[PDB]
RNA sequence: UUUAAUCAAAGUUAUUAUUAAAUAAUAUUGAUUUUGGAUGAAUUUAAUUUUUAAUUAUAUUUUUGAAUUUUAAUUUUAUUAUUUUGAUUUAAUAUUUUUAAAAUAUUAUAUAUUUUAGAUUUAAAUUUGUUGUUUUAUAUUU
RNA sequence: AGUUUAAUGUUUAAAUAUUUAACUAGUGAUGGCACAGUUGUUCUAUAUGUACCUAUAAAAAAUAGUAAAAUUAUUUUAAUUAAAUUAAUAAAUAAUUAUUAAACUAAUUUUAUAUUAAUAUUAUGAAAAAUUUUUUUUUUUUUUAAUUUUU
RNA sequence: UAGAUGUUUAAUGUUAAUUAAUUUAUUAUUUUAAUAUUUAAUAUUUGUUUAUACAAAAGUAACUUUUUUUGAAUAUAAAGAAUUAUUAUUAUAAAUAUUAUUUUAAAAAUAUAAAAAUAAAUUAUAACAAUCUAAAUAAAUAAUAAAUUAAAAUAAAAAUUUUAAAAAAAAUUAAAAAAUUAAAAUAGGGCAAGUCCUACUCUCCUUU
RNA sequence: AUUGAAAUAAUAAAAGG
C-alpha cells in the first residue's frame, strides 16, 4: 500500500462503470430524520476537524503530554499516585520537598503546562489537576559485562507523562501560609 | 477508506494541546539536568568502535530518502522535453483538476 | 524464584505500611514568612535573616 | 527464508531435477530364482 | 486440535486479573470451568437441587403432623401424579391446597380404582342374521357410547345445541342428507 | 463513543463502525452462554454492553465537559459551517449575481445544502431550549445562517423549523421594541450607551434587510 | 456462527435506493426461483439465434430449410453418432454488414455432440493447471542456505536444544526439506480422445445456449484497431472489459479456408477487453515425453508431458470466460475435413460397411471424385 | 484430508497421535518386514532353486512367442478390417490395428486356436509357430498357412516396409 | 469534608519505497585506479582418468551378496541464458514502527455468571506391575 | 621477589584470582631458526598444541534402523478390546485390530446372532507352590429415578 | 432438540467474469526469533584527597597551522585481559613536585581485623575496638503451568504420591533464619562373566 | 576341530545380601 499512489486524491472514489475507470465523489452515511443520505465526504470530514477542535478549546483544561521524561514508569506511576487530586497550588509545592526525580520531572512539566495554560486564558489560581497518567516510552540499552564471560542488557527505560489540568472556580485552598507558634518568636528582634 | 479521516487528535483520543518531545535539542538543558548527579554516562566526547568506516543507513531511512531525491535515478527527466517557460498548460488530474495558467519556469 | 506472581499479588506489597510510609505521604509545608518559597519546620535557609531567626 | 539474508544473501548450493531408480528394481533377481508366480490375474 | 479458542476468548472478558490479560492462560482456565460446568450439570447438579426440594415439601409437610416418608407413599397411593417440584410449588404459593392434599392423604377415602381393561360387549357375540339394510348390533351402541361421551365434554353450544337435541336423533344425522 | 452523539455531536457509529469479531468481549457478557450468541440488540443486553464500551462520553467521570447545548454556541458554530462548505466566493455570485456559478459551484452549493440539514437534524433539539436564555446578539443570525445556505428561510424538522423561525422572529422584534424604549442596561460601568448606538442601529438595519429576501 | 447477532445493517433505508417490499404482485431486481450465480436476461447476454433457446425446440437455430435464403450443405457428409443431437441443425451464417447472407447445415458430429459436465471438466481441470506459471513456484531447500556445517553448538552441555546446523523449516532462514520446485509439478497428459472429446461438447454448449454464430469472413478492409472496435459495433460484439466478450476462432472465408488469421485481422484483433482469437482446429498433438524416468537431470518445468497444448487454442476457461462464439466459415471446413477420418473409424462395423455406398469413402487419389476444396 | 493409522483407521489431522507408533514407521520408509520372526524359517531359505538361470529366465534366443488368439482374427475379417481376398502378414495386423505394436516382440506371433471349431472362408496366413490344431483349421478350410520365422531384423524389414 | 478497606483495562497509531525469488539460450582474460621500474625474469599452472562437459526404456549377465538400456536423423534447432515496456511475466511484501481510553457485585477466607448455594486432577507426551514415572510450558505475536 | 600446595572466591576485581604448601642455587638459557593432527613437544602424565583435545577450519551423508520428542481440521454415525505361536520330503487358514468389499439355505420362537474375502499390521515381555466383589471412563438440555441405618 | 449405531474441514466469501459498506472461520499448548513481564521496594554501582619517570611492538574512536632536522624522503601521543575493569604492559634510565576520583546519622549473622592467659618470632580468639546502613539515583541475574489459597491433625491407591477425603481455622506488611519443599534406581562388602591388560606354539587382509 | 592362555590386580555391566 501506498497513499501516495494507491489513493491519490482521498476525496474521490474511483469506480468501474461501464468498464471505465471513473472517479466520482466520496460521501459518507450521515444520519438524518431516520434515513441515511449521502454528504460530501469532504464536508463531512471538515466539520469534524473543526467541530471538535472547536469543541475541546472552548473546555477549561490544558492538555499537555510530555513525551520521553528520563525515567522508568514502574518507578514514575507510584510519585504520580500523590499527586492525583492534588491542586497545582499544592502540586509543585509537594513536588518541589520531595527527593525523588519522578517528581522534579513532574515539576518541571507542571511548570512548562502552567505558563502555556496562560496564553490559553487560564488563571494560574484555580488550575487543578485533573488527569495524570503514565505510558510506558522508547527504551534504551546498554551492555552489562558480566564475570564469566556472560553478559546482559541494562535496559534504560524512559515514559511519558500525559497531564491535563482542569479548572475549577470553586477550588478553595486549606491554609498555609499559617506561620508555626515558634518561629512566632520573631517578636525578639522586632 | 471505510471510516472519516480527522485531526489526529480528535478522534484517535489522546487529545493534547501542547505536545512537547523531551529528545529534542532545545530540551537538551531541561532532561540532562532532570536525571541525578549519580547517573553517569560515559562516552561524552569518544566513542568506543571506530566511526570513521563507511556504513549504510538503516532500512526505513533509505526508503525515506530514496522518495525525496528520485531524480537521482539515471535519466529521470522525461525522454522529450515538451514543456517549456511560457507554453499555455492546464492541469488534468489531482489538486484542482482543470485550471489554465501559462508556465513561467520549468 | 518458584514461580511468577499474578497481579493480585504484586499490589500485595501496596496494602502494608511500609510501602505507604515510603512512597504515598504528604509532607506538612507553609510558606517561610521571610524566605517566601515552603519549608518544614526545623529547617532553614540561608540567608542571615532566615539563619538568626529560625523561621 | 524470510525474505533476504546472509542465509539467502549468498549462494550455497542449488539442486536439480532428482534421477529416477531402475524401473524394475523391485522384482529382485533372488526372487526371479526361488519362485514362479503362476494362476490368473486375481 | 481444535481448541474453541474462538468462542473462549471473548469468554476472557469476565476473569480476574491473569486469565483476562494473558491469551493462553486464559484459555486453560476458561476451558476448566466450562469443562466442569457442563460436567457438574450432567452429573452432580440433579441429585444436589433434587433434594433441596424434597426437603421444601417436607419441612412444609412438618406442619401438618406428617413427613416426606409418608406423604410420597400417599400422594401416589391416592393416584394423585403431581411431580416432587409441584408438591414445592403449592407449599409455597398455595398453601391451602397443598394441606386441603394433605387431609386427603390422610383421610380414609378410597383411592380411585386401578382403569379397567378392554371388555368385549355382549353384542360381539350375539349372532347377527343375513341382514344387510340395518347396522350391525355392536356399531349401534358403540356409536351412542360415542356421541354421548361427545356431549359430555365442554359446554359446547353446538350452534346453541342445534345439533339433534337428543342423542337417538344424533345417530340419525345421516337421514339429514337423504331425499 | 458508542453510538457516537448521543444528544449532542454529529458524529456516530452506524454501519461504518463495524463488528470485530477477534477480541476479547468486554463488557455485558452476564452469562458465559453469551459467546455463541451474544443477543445484542436485546435491550437489557445492550446496556450491559453499550454503556462500558467507548466512553458514553463524560470527560472522565468529573472532567469538564462541553457546553454544547447553548445558543452562546450552537449559532457561532453554525456560522463557520456555512462560512466554510460555502465560501464567500460562492456568497458573493449568489448574493450578488443572479448568474448561474458554475456545475461544480452549484454543486458545492448543493454539497452545503444538505450540510445545513444534517447539523440542524442533530442540534435542533438543543436549539428550542437555550433559546429562552438566548441573547439578541445570537437571535440575530438565526435568518443569517440560511442565506450562505441559500435557502429562502422559511419529528420532521421542517415542523420544527417554522414554529421556531416564528418564535425567534417575535423575540427579535420584542428586543428591537424593547430597544427603543430601552432601560438603564448598565448604569456602571458604561453608563454612557457608547458603541451602543452603531451596534444596535445596525442590527435594526440588518435585520429587516434580510426580511425582503426571506 | 450467528455471533454478530447486531451492528450488521444500520436500522434506516439508504436515501432513494432503498425501496421496501411493495407485495406479491410486483417484481424485483434479480428474484428468479433458480440458483444462479450469473443472472442474465436477453439483454445483458443477448444470445445471437434465430429462437430462443427452450426446452421446447432442442435448439435455437432452425431446423428446416427456411425457403427465403440459399441453402448451403456441409462440405463432408453427416452421419450421427453416439452423442450426436439427431436433428438437423441449420444455422444462418452472417455477414460483415450485420445481415443473414444464405443458411447451413451444422456438422452433428462436432456441433451436435450433447454436452457432459463429466467430460468439461477434464478440459477445465486440464487447463487450469496447465495454464500455469511453474517457475514461480520455486522455493529453497535445506541444501541451499550457505549456514555452517558443525552443530552450532556442543549438544550437551549447553543450556539449549538438541539442534545441529540450524538451517531447518523451523527457523526464520531453513527452507522446507522436499520443497516446491517447478520439476517437482505435474504438466497433466492429454490424448486426443478426450481433448477433441471434450472440445466438441464444448462448442455444443456454445450452441444449445445460443451463443453461437456463423460468419463468412472475418477480414478488417484496414489493419487498424478501429475497423476491428467499429467491426464489433455494427456486428454487435459487446467486448468491453467487464460485459461478456466474444471468442473468434478465425479460417478465412467459404472459398479461401486459411488455417492462419488474415493479416488485417490479426493486427486489429489486439484490444484489451473480453476477445479472443485462437486456432480454427478442436483437435490437437499426441502426447509425448522424453524425460519421462528424469533421465536429462538437467531439464527444468513439470514432470509429465513435454509437448503442452499452446494457450491459443479453444480450452474450456475461455469457451465461458467469452461468452460469444464467433466462427468463421473456412474454420468450419477445416474441422469437418480433420474430424472426417476421426468420425468414420468411431462407426461400429455393420455401419461403417455402408459408408462407400453413401458417397462418404470417394478417395481423391483414387480419381473417383474431382477433389475436394 | 486424513491419516490412514495401520490398526486404528482415518484419524483427523490435529487428532490424537498417542497411538500412531506404527504409522510414524511406514511413512519414514522404514521397514522391518515381519523380522522379529527369527524363530520361524521362511521357504526363502530352503526353497533349492533349479536353474541357474531360473525357472523361466528369458536368456536371449529364448523363442517365446505373443500369443495371438485366432478368435480375434476371424472378428476383424468379419468386422472389415482385413481382406480375406489376400495374404494376410504382420504388417496388415499391425496397420489394420488388429493387434497393437505392443504385442510384436521377436519372434513376432503364434496363431492359438482356442474354444474355435471351425473357419468359413479360406484363409492364407504368415504367422510365426501358428498351433498345431490352428494349422489344421486353415488348412481344412481350402485356406492354408506358412511358418515365416524370421530374424530380426527380418521382422523390421517387414512391419516398416 | 467524610473516603473502613477493597475491586476493572475493550476492539487504533503517520509519511516517505518498487526491492526480492524463479523464469528468458544473442557477453566474458580475474570486479574495486594507473605493471615491471632492472629494463628483466617478479605478473607462468601445462600431463589421454564419470571433468563447472550433468546419460529417452521394464530384458540378459557375471558372485542373482548392489549393481543396471544401445546414434535418432551424422553442424538441425536441450540451447548455460538480459534487452529503449517501472525488461518480461508470475510468486513473495517489511520498520523508524511509537501508537495508545472510565468507581457492578466483597467487607469475618473456600476458585466466574451477579437468589446470595452447589461444583472442582492445569495440560500434552511419558509410562501396556505402574492411567499414577518423575520430562515439557512465563506470556505475546510471527 | 623464579618452581609441584591449601582456604576464600562461587556470573567472582579474574571463562583459575589472593593468601596457605611440598626442593633444587644458573661458566649453559627469556623467543633466534625449527616441528603439526591415523599426530607434534615428549624430563613416556593416552599430560599440552589459543578460554569444552569430541584439536580448529571447510564441504557432506549412513548417523533415535533407539521406552527418543514433535506431527496444524469441534459439533461425528457401525462392532470386538490378550489374542496368537510346529525351522527344516505329499498335512485346509497365525492372531489382532484396520481399510475396502461380499453372501442366507437341510439348521424352530412369527426369538436371536458381525459370517466371508482382499489388503494394511507380527516384541509390551512373569518366576515358584497349589490344582485334575462389580458393570463401569463418558453423558445435547430440561424434568423424572426402585440399592440407609451403630454400638 | 433432533437425520443415523460417533476421528479422511465446510467455500463462486465483494464471481481472481467484483468494484462503497466483505463487516470474510480463525488462531498448531511445546522445537522458532522478535517483543513483554516476573525475580526487582532488588544484587552491583556511589568518587573530599597519592608521592610522578623516558624504548619497542601496541591505536589511529584522531585532531591539528604554527617552527622536527640544517640530512631528501618519510613518520612524531592513544593497550591488553569484551571495559574508562583485580594492572607501574618496564628493554632501559632513574631520585626530597602535597602534581590531583571514592558516597552514606543505628541493629544482627558473617567478612577483614583485634588490649589480657594453659626467650623466640608463633598459636587458637568462633572476645573489646575498627570497616561494611537506610532512604535518594541507577539498575541487572539465573527462575517462572497455573493456582484461590495456605496454618495444624488425621486414614486411604502394585504407589514412590502429586492429589483427593474427613476434621480443623488458617489475617496483612517488612525483616532475619533455613526446618520443609525446586540438583541421577546410589555408597560397602561377597560372587561370576567382560572390556582393559600382559604372553605366545597353532588364526586372519596386513605394508615396510 | 578352524589360534590357544593367564585373580587379566582396575574398569564396566549383571545378579546375590
Redesign the pocket.
Given at each position: 500500500?501506498?497513499?501516495?499512489?494507491?489513493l491519490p486524491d482521498v476525496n474521490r472514489?474511483?469506480?468501474?462503470?461501464n468498464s471505465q475507470?471513473v472517479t466520482?465523489?466520496?460521501?459518507?452515511?450521515v444520519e438524518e430524520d431516520g434515513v441515511?443520505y449521502?454528504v460530501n465526504?469532504k464536508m463531512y470530514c471538515e466539520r469534524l476537524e473543526t467541530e471538535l477542535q472547536k469543541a475541546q478549546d472552548q473546555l477549561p483544561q490544558y492538555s499537555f503530554?510530555m513525551?520521553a521524561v528520563?525515567?522508568?514508569?514502574?518507578?514514575?506511576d507510584i510519585?504520580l499516585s500523590v499527586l492525583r487530586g492534588l491542586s497545582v497550588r499544592e502540586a509543585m509545592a509537594q513536588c518541589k520537598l520531595s527527593?525523588?526525580?519522578?517528581?522534579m520531572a513532574v515539576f518541571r512539566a507542571l511548570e512548562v503546562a502552567q505558563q502555556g495554560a496562560e496564553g490559553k486564558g487560564l488563571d494560574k489560581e484555580h488550575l487543578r489537576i485533573a488527569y495524570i497518567?503514565c505510558?510506558?516510552?522508547?527504551?534504551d540499552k546498554?551492555?552489562?559485562?558480566?564475570?564469566?564471560?556472560?553478559?546482559?542488557?541494562?535496559?534504560?527505560?524512559?515514559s511519558?507523562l500525559?497531564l491535563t489540568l482542569a479548572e475549577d472556580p470553586e477550588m478553595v485552598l486549606?491554609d498555609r501560609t499559617a506561620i508555626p507558634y515558634a518561629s512566632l518568636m520573631t517578636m525578639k528582634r522586632a | 477508506?471505510?471510516?472519516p479521516?480527522v485531526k489526529?487528535?480528535l478522534?484517535?483520543?489522546?487529545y493534547?494541546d501542547e505536545?512537547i518531545?523531551l529528545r529534542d535539542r532545545e530540551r537538551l538543558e531541561l532532561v540532562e539536568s532532570i536525571?541525578?548527579?549519580?547517573?553517569?554516562?560515559?562516552?561524552?566526547?569518544?566513542?568506543?568502535?571506530?566511526?570513521?568506516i563507511a556504513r549504510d543507513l538503516?532500512?526505513?531511512?533509505?526508503?525515506?530518502?530514496?522518495?525525496?531525491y528520485?531524480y537521482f535515478?539515471p535519466?529521470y527527466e522525461i525522454?522529450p522535453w515538451i514543456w517549456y517557460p511560457g507554453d499555455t498548460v492546464e492541469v488534468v488530474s489531482g489538486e484542482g483538476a482543470g485550471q489554465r495558467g501559462a508556465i513561467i519556469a520549468v | 524464584?518458584?514461580?511468577?506472581?499474578?497481579?493480585?499479588?504484586?499490589?500485595?506489597?501496596?496494602?502494608?505500611?511500609?510501602?505507604?510510609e515510603?512512597?504515598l505521604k504528604l509532607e506538612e509545608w507553609y510558606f517561610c514568612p521571610l524566605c517566601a518559597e515552603p519549608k518544614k519546620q526545623g529547617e532553614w535557609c540561608r540567608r542571615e535573616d532566615c539563619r538568626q531567626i529560625k523561621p | 527464508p524470510k525474505?533476504?539474508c546472509e542465509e539467502?544473501?549468498r549462494?550455497?548450493?542449488?539442486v536439480?531435477?532428482k534421477?529416477?531408480?531402475?524401473?524394475?528394481?523391485h522384482?529382485?533377481?533372488?526372487?526371479?530364482?526361488?519362485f514362479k508366480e503362476m494362476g490368473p490375474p486375481? | 486440535?481444535?481448541?474453541?479458542?474462538?468462542?473462549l476468548?471473548?469468554?476472557?472478558?469476565?476473569?480476574?486479573?491473569?486469565?483476562?490479560?494473558?491469551?493462553?492462560?486464559?484459555?486453560?482456565?476458561?476451558?476448566?470451568?466450562?469443562?466442569?460446568?457442563?460436567?457438574?450439570?450432567?452429573?452432580?447438579?440433579?441429585?444436589?437441587?433434587?433434594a433441596?426440594?424434597?426437603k421444601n415439601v417436607d419441612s412444609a409437610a412438618h406442619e401438618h403432623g406428617s413427613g416426606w416418608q409418608h406423604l410420597?407413599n400417599d400422594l401416589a397411593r391416592q393416584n394423585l401424579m403431581l411431580?416432587?417440584?409441584t408438591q414445592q410449588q403449592l407449599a409455597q404459593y398455595e398453601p391451602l391446597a397443598f394441606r386441603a392434599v394433605m387431609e386427603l392423604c390422610a383421610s380414609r377415602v378410597a383411592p380411585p380404582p386401578p382403569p379397567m381393561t378392554a371388555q368385549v360387549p355382549e353384542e360381539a357375540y350375539a349372532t347377527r342374521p343375513e341382514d344387510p339394510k340395518v347396522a350391525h348390533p355392536a356399531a349401534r351402541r358403540q356409536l351412542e357410547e360415542c356421541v354421548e361421551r361427545m356431549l359430555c365434554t365442554g359446554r359446547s353450544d353446538v350452534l346453541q345445541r342445534e345439533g339433534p337435541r337428543t342423542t337417538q336423533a344424533w345417530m340419525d344425522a345421516w337421514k339429514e342428507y337423504d331425499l | 463513543?458508542?453510538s457516537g452523539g448521543g444528544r449532542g455531536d454529529l458524529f456516530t457509529?452506524?454501519?461504518?463502525?463495524?463488528?470485530?469479531?477477534?477480541?476479547?468481549?468486554?463488557?455485558?457478557?452476564?452469562?458465559?452462554?453469551?459467546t455463541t450468541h451474544p443477543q445484542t440488540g436485546q435491550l437489557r443486553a445492550r446496556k450491559?454492553?453499550q454503556?462500558?464500551?467507548?466512553?458514553?462520553?463524560?470527560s472522565?467521570?468529573g472532567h469538564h465537559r462541553t457546553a454544547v447545548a447553548t445558543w452562546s454556541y450552537l449559532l457561532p458554530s453554525l456560522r463557520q459551517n456555512v462560512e466554510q462548505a460555502v465560501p464567500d466566493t460562492l456568497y458573493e455570485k449568489l448574493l450578488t449575481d443572479e448568474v448561474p456559478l458554475t456545475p461544480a459551484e452549484s454543486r458545492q452549493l448543493a454539497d452545503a445544502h444538505r450540510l445545513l440539514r444534517f447539523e440542524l437534524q442533530k442540534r435542533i433539539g438543543l436549539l428550542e431550549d437555550s433559546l429562552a436564555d438566548a441573547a439578541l446578539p445570537y437571535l440575530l443570525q438565526w435568518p443569517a445562517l440560511f442565506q450562505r445556505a441559500w435557502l429562502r428561510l422559511p419529528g420532521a424538522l421542517v415542523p420544527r423549523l417554522a414554529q421556531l423561525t416564528r418564535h425567534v422572529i417575535r423575540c427579535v422584534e420584542e428586543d428591537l421594541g424593547r430597544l427603543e424604549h430601552g432601560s438603564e442596561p448598565r448604569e456602571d460601568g458604561a453608563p454612557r450607551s457608547r458603541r451602543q448606538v452603531t451596534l444596535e442601529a445596525a442590527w435594526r438595519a440588518q435585520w429587516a434587510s434580510l426580511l425582503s429576501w426571506h | 456462527?450467528?455471533?454478530?447477532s447486531s451492528?450488521?445493517?444500520?436500522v434506516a433505508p439508504?436515501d432513494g435506493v432503498d425501496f421496501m417490499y411493495e407485495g406479491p404482485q410486483q417484481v424485483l431486481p434479480g428474484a428468479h426461483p433458480l440458483?444462479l450465480?450469473?443472472?442474465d436476461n436477453s439483454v445483458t447476454?443477448p444470445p445471437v439465434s434465430p429462437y430462443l433457446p427452450s426446452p421446447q425446440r432442442p435448439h435455437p437455430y432452425f431446423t428446416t430449410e427456411l425457403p427465403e435464403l440459399p441453402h448451403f450443405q456441409t462440405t463432408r457428409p453427416i452421419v450421427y453418432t453416439v452423442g450426436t443431437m439427431k436433428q438437423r441443425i441449420v444455422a444462418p451464417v452472417f455477414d460483415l454488414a450485420n445481415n443473414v447472407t444464405h443458411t447451413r447445415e451444422l456438422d452433428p458430429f462436432i456441433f451436435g455432440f450433447y454436452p457432459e459436465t463429466e467430460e468439461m471438466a477434464k478440459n477445465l481441470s486440464y487447463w487450469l493447471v496447465r495454464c500455469?506459471?511453474?517457475?514461480?513456484?520455486?522455493?529453497?531447500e535445506?541444501?541451499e542456505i550457505?549456514?555452517?556445517?558443525?552443530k552450532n553448538?556442543?549438544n550437551?552441555?549447553?543450556?539449549?536444544?538438541?539442534?545441529?546446523?540450524?538451517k531447518?523449516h523451523?527457523?526464520?532462514?531453513g527452507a522446507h526439506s522436499k520443497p516446491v520446485?517447478?520439476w517437482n509439478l505435474l504438466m497433466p497428459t492429454m490424448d486426443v480422445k478426450t481433448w477433441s472429446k471434450s472440445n466438441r461438447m464444448l462448442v455444443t454448449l456454445k450452441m444449445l445456449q445460443g451463443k453461437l454464430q456463423i460468419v463468412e469472413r472475418l477480414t478488417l478492409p484496414e489493419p487498424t484497431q478501429e475497423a476491428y472496435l467499429q467491426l464489433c459495433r455494427t456486428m454487435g460484439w459487446d467486448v468491453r472489459?467487464?460485459?461478456?466478450?466474444a471468442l473468434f476462432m478465425d479460417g478465412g472465408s467459404r472459398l479461401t479456408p486459411s488455417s492462419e488469421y488474415d493479416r488485417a485481422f490479426f493486427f486489429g484483433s489486439f484490444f484489451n477487453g473480453?476477445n479472443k482469437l485462437v486456432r480454427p482446429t478442436l483437435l490437437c498433438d499426441e502426447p509425448?515425453?522424453?524425460?519421462?524416468?528424469s533421465?536429462?537431470?538437467?531439464?527444468?518445468?513439470p514432470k509429465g508431458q513435454?509437448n503442452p497444448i499452446p494457450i491459443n487454442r479453444f480450452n474450456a476457461?475461455d469457451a465461458?470466460?467469452?461468452?460469444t462464439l464467433i466462427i468463421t466459415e473456412g474454420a468450419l471446413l477445416q474441422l469437418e475435413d480433420e474430424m472426417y477420418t476421426h468420425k468414420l473409424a468411431m462407426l461400429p462395423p455393420h455401419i461403417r460397411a455402408q459408408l462407400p455406398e453413401r458417397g462418404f469413402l470417394d478417395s481423391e487419389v483414387l480419381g473417383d471424385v474431382p477433389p475436394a476444396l | 484430508?486424513?491419516?490412514?493409522?495401520?490398526?486404528?483407521?482415518?484419524?483427523?489431522?490435529?487428532?490424537?497421535?498417542?497411538?500412531?507408533?506404527?504409522?510414524?514407521?511406514?511413512?519414514?520408509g522404514?521397514?522391518?518386514?515381519?523380522?522379529?520372526?527369527r524363530?520361524?524359517?521362511p521357504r526363502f531359505?530352503?526353497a533349492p532353486?533349479v536353474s541357474?538361470?531360473?525357472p523361466?529366465?528369458?536368456?536371449?534366443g529364448k523363442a517365446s512367442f505373443s500369443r495371438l488368439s485366432l478368435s480375434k482374427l476371424l472378428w476383424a475379417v468379419d468386422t472389415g478390417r482385413l481382406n480375406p481376398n489376400e495374404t494376410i502378414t504382420l504388417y496388415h495386423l499391425r496397420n489394420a490395428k488388429v493387434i497393437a505394436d505392443r504385442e510384436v516382440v521377436w519372434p513376432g506371433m503364434v496363431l492359438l486356436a482356442g474354444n474355435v471349431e471351425r473357419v468359413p472362408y479360406p484363409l492364407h496366413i504368415e504367422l510365426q509357430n501358428a498351433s498345431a490344431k490352428a494349422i489344421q483349421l486353415l488348412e481344412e478350410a481350402g485356406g492354408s498357412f506358412t511358418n515365416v520365422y524370421m530374424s530380426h531384423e527380418g521382422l523390421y524389414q517387414e512391419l516398416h516396409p
Open positions: 500500500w501506498l497513499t501516495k499512489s494507491n472514489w474511483e469506480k468501474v462503470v475507470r466520482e465523489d466520496r460521501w459518507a452515511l441515511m449521502q465526504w503530554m513525551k528520563p525515567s522508568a514508569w514502574k518507578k514514575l510519585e527527593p525523588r526525580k519522578g517528581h497518567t505510558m510506558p516510552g522508547p527504551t546498554q551492555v552489562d559485562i558480566r564475570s564469566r564471560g556472560y553478559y546482559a542488557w541494562k535496559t534504560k527505560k524512559s511519558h500525559l486549606p | 477508506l471505510r471510516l479521516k489526529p487528535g478522534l484517535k483520543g489522546i493534547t505536545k518531545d536525571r541525578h548527579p549519580k547517573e553517569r554516562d560515559f562516552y561524552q566526547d569518544h566513542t568506543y568502535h571506530n566511526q570513521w538503516e532500512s526505513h531511512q533509505k526508503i525515506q530518502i530514496a522518495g525525496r528520485p535515478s535519466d525522454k | 524464584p518458584k514461580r511468577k506472581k499474578n497481579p493480585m499479588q504484586l499490589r500485595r506489597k501496596t496494602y502494608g505500611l511500609h510501602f505507604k515510603r512512597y | 525474505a533476504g539467502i544473501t549462494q550455497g548450493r542449488r536439480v531435477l534421477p529416477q531408480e531402475y524401473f524394475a528394481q522384482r529382485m533377481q533372488v526372487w526371479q530364482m526361488r486375481f | 486440535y481444535y481448541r474453541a479458542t474462538a468462542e476468548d471473548r469468554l476472557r472478558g469476565m476473569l480476574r486479573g491473569r486469565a483476562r490479560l494473558e491469551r493462553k492462560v486464559g484459555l486453560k482456565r476458561i476451558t476448566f470451568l466450562m469443562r466442569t460446568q457442563t460436567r457438574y450439570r450432567v452429573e452432580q447438579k440433579a441429585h444436589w437441587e433434587r433441596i426440594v424434597r410420597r411431580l416432587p417440584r | 463513543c458508542i457509529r452506524h454501519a461504518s463502525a463495524f463488528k470485530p469479531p477477534a477480541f476479547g468481549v468486554l463488557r455485558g457478557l452476564t452469562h458465559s452462554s453469551q450491559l454492553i454503556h462500558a464500551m467507548h466512553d458514553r462520553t463524560l472522565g467521570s | 456462527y450467528d455471533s454478530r451492528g450488521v445493517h444500520d439508504r440458483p450465480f450469473h443472472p447476454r500455469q506459471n511453474f517457475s514461480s513456484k520455486w522455493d529453497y535445506n541444501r550457505w549456514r555452517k556445517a558443525k553448538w556442543p550437551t552441555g549447553m543450556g539449549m536444544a538438541r539442534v545441529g546446523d540450524r531447518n523451523a527457523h526464520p532462514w520446485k517447478p472489459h467487464k460485459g461478456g466478450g473480453r509425448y515425453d522424453y524425460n519421462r524416468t533421465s536429462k537431470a538437467r531439464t527444468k518445468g513435454k476457461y465461458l470466460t467469452h461468452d | 484430508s486424513g491419516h490412514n493409522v495401520i490398526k486404528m483407521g482415518w484419524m483427523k489431522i490435529g487428532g490424537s497421535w498417542k497411538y500412531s507408533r506404527s504409522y510414524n514407521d511406514a511413512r519414514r522404514f521397514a522391518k518386514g515381519q523380522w522379529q520372526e524363530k520361524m524359517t531359505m530352503l532353486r541357474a538361470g531360473g523361466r529366465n528369458r536368456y536371449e
